[PDB]
Enzyme design. Structure first.
Site, PDB file in Angstrom:
ATOM      1  N   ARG B 372     -22.593  39.119  40.311  1.00  0.00           N
ATOM      2  CA  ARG B 372     -22.662  39.416  41.737  1.00  0.00           C
ATOM      3  C   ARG B 372     -21.868  40.658  42.115  1.00  0.00           C
ATOM      4  O   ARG B 372     -22.000  41.131  43.249  1.00  0.00           O
ATOM      5  CB  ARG B 372     -22.181  38.216  42.552  1.00  0.00           C
ATOM      6  N   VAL B 373     -21.061  41.195  41.207  1.00  0.00           N
ATOM      7  CA  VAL B 373     -20.352  42.448  41.425  1.00  0.00           C
ATOM      8  C   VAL B 373     -20.766  43.442  40.347  1.00  0.00           C
ATOM      9  O   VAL B 373     -20.791  43.116  39.155  1.00  0.00           O
ATOM     10  CB  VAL B 373     -18.822  42.246  41.450  1.00  0.00           C
TER      11      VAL B 373
END
Ligand SMILES: Nc1ncnc2c1ncn2[C@@H]1O[C@H](COP(=O)(O)OP(=O)(O)OP(=O)(O)O)[C@@H](O)[C@H]1O
Ligand SMILES: [Mg+2]
Lengths: 57, 506, 51
Positions: B372-373
């Site tokens: 997600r990053v």
């Protein structure tokens, strides 16, 4: 000091210290190593003298 | 050793002093004991989840507080407990000792030294059920965690405070990535800069004692135990202990997180946490949910995992990175706990046996493995300065997207095919061999300017090793410059390109 | 020579474990069990009198 029953470390520590001069280096090559080089000067300058002459010739 | 004799003497005298200062009357009486469960009549003012002592010497936690009799689970065996036994109350909720003396030691779920190296120097004592940090007292993840795995570094970035799941099947390499990260942290764990220190804390819920023995032998061999703490909950221990251990380790890591340091937690095989909770709930006659699991397993996992966070500068800018592990049966990620954990984490690292048997040792399914990053929590040298390290994800998607169904049409397709297969053979790595960013950058940078000219597939591995040698020798300036500054400047890009092409001509 | 000392530590505690067996067998053959009830009586007096 981690061992409260030491009894050998001082002997071992001394054993390290008595053999602290383990063994010297071996710089024995002082007559044959340059003999490889003396052939190196002979052939390289033979080549360089020829190629320098031939490039202009 | 007479010293332990007087130590035990003073132990026994304070034992007497503590024992004969209670005069309790609410001390309950055991009505019946089940399979690790004991309903007790008494303890009118008992708190919820509160620890107890039995007269025999076994601990217990107050789960059910129904009127009249109280549901007590057992931290240990029901071996020594009978009916009509007086049950001592601690007066406090279940607690675990925390501190900096934990490093280099192995303890159990409660926190007792189990390695046999003496007592534990604890700087404090924190709860096993502490509240996760709020919405404001935290900061976004920016500092990257260097795994040492090129496929886990340049493709699926992780950072301080994120939650990356190692989802996969049995004996696929789930523990391998975690132990590799632990070994890789040794590079900065030996320095002085505390903002780059990553102490490692590891849970062992359900794994047999032989496995944890081999594991701890491993960390001490590579000299990583000095900054690691191992909490163990073998299948031999009672279900309450296994269910409690991850929370205690979370508090252990939160000690460092709140003290401004940085730490890493590996929630190894969090599924057996769920099955232990299942045993707990079923033995308490609590109504079950889907497929016999207790209903509040999602809440169980959420409360545990969300405690890991990246704090903001106001409280000290500490961090705690969760590294949970879930094993799936036959690759069924649609299974209940796998779905909950994939929905709870900040990304995942998929590993499957099929790629493992295809030769890929990490077995990272880059198709599903996502973080997600992206740009955040990634070293800049493995980023826009390298250019394509912004967009290898698309390249590896397309190379898989034209294998035979997208059959080679023209020279562009053949070039992309060769590039992709050379890269997939390049991403291979071996266990117990962590790598560093300063030599990640050259290898994958060579993957854009000259990779198809690699010296046939079976010999691209020594190609990467010889490239690393040709850059560590006679080219240490590049490795240094990219390792302290962390990015590639214009002249640095030119020098790196020159070196890559120079060894390509070689 | 270190883990031998460490094993010396562990083995020494192990015969102390069977020493307690010798200790505990000495504990069960005394008239102190008669005398020990007086110890509770004086102790329990000191306990509740504190309150
Ligand atoms: N990079 C690698 N190189 C060589 N062997 C590897 C590598 N990664 C994993 N293995 C091997 O794969 C097997 C499983 O790896 P690992 O010890 O990480 O187990 P796991 O996937 O965590 O499974 P489990 O849940 O059973 O503990 C072991 O035999 C290990 O030696
Ligand atoms: Mg494993």
């Amino acid at each position: 000091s981690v061992l409260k029953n030491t009894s050998v470390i001082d002997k071992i520590e001394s054993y390290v210290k008595q053999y602290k001069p383990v063994k010297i280096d071996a710089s024995k090559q002082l007559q044959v190593i340059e003999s490889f080089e003396k052939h190196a000067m002979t052939n390289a300058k033979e080549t360089e003298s020829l190629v320098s002459k031939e490039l202009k010739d | 050793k007479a010293q332990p004799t007087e130590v035990s003497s003073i132990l026994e005298e304070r034992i007497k002093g503590v024992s004969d200062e209670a005069n309790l009357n609410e001390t309950g009486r055991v009505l019946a004991v089940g399979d690790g469960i004991a309903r007790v009549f008494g303890l009118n003012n008992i708190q919820a989840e509160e620890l107890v002592e039995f007269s025999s010497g076994v601990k217990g936690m107050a789960l059910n507080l129904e009127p009249g009799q109280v549901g007590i689970v057992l931290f240990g065996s029901d071996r020594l407990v009978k009916e009509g036994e007086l049950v001592k109350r601690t007066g406090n909720i279940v607690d675990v000792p925390v501190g900096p003396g934990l490093l280099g030691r192995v303890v159990d779920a409660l926190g007792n030294p189990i390695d046999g190296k003496g007592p534990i120097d604890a700087a404090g004592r924190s709860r096993a059920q502490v509240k996760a940090p709020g919405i404001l007292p935290r900061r976004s993840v920016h500092e990257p965690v260097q795994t040492g795995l090129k496929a886990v570094d340049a493709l699926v970035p992780i950072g301080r405070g994120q939650r990356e799941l190692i989802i996969g099947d049995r004996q696929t390499g789930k523990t391998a990535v975690a132990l590799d990260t632990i070994l890789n942290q040794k590079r900065w764990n030996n320095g002085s800069d505390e903002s780059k220190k990553l102490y490692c804390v590891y849970v062992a819920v359900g794994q047999k004692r032989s496995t944890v023995a081999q594991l701890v032998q491993t960390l001490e061999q590579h000299d990583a135990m000095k900054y690691s703490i191992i909490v163990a909950a073998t299948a031999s221990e009672a279900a309450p202990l296994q269910y409690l251990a991850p929370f205690t380790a979370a508090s252990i890591g939160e000690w460092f997180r709140d003290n401004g340091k940085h730490a890493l937690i590996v929630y190894d095989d969090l599924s057996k946490q769920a099955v232990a909770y299942r045993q707990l709930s079923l033995l308490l006659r609590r109504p079950p949910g889907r497929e016999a699991y207790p209903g509040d397993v999602f809440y169980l996992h959420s409360r545990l995992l969300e405690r890991a966070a990246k704090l903001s500068e106001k409280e000290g800018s500490g961090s705690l990175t969760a590294l949970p592990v879930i094993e799936t049966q036959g690759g069924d990620v649609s299974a209940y706990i796998p779905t909950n954990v994939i929905s709870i984490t900040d990304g995942q690292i998929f590993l499957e046996a099929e790629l493992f048997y295809k030769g890929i040792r990490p077995a990272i399914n880059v198709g599903l493995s996502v973080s997600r990053v992206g740009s955040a929590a990634q070293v800049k040298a493995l980023k826009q300065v390298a250019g394509s390290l912004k967009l290898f994800l698309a390249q590896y998607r397309e190379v898989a997207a034209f294998a035979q169904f997208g059959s080679d049409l023209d020279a562009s397709t053949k070039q992309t095919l060769v590039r992709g297969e050379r890269l997939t053979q390049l991403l291979k790595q071996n266990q117990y061999s962590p790598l560093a960013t300063e030599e990640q950058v050259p290898l994958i940078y060579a993957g854009v300017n000259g990779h198809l000219d690699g010296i046939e597939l079976s010999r691209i591995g020594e190609f990467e090793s010889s490239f690393l040698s040709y850059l560590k020798s006679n080219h240490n300036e590049l490795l240094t410059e990219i390792r302290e500054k962390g990015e590639l400047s214009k002249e640095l890009l030119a020098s790196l390109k020159s070196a890559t092409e120079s060894f390509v001509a070689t | 020579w270190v883990r031998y000392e460490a094993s010396l530590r562990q083995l020494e505690q192990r015969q102390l474990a069977k020493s307690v067996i010798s200790r505990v067998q000495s504990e069960l053959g005394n008239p102190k069990f008669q005398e020990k009830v007086l110890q509770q009586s004086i102790s329990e007096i000191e306990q509740l009198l504190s309150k």
